[PDB]
Amino acid sequence: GSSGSSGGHCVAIYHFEGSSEGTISMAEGEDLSLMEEDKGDGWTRVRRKEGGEGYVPTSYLRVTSGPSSG
Numbered sequence: 057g058s059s060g061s062s063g064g065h066c067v068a069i070y071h072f073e074g075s076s077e078g079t080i081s082m083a084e085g086e087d088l089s090l091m092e093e094d095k096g097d098g099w100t101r102v103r104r105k106e107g108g109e110g111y112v113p114t115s116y117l118r119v120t121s122g123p124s125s126g
Contacts, residue, residue: 064090065120066102072116080110088117 092101
């Protein structure tokens with residue numbers, strides 16, 4: 057079957073390196089798996105295909121918002 061999961065889709069907008077003792081790194085335009093939403097906090101937790109998840113700034117997250125993904 058297809059390879060995906062209906063729930064939350066987001067991609068890194070700008071290069072964000074997780075230096076702090078509690079953050080994840082992503083690549084400009086990289087696919088991520090939304091896990092923990094951000095409520096007026098600006099912090100979102102996403103997972104990586106490999107197996108790494110951390111708290112990234114929503115500002116650096118652009119909701120794919122692209123249905124009918126062929």
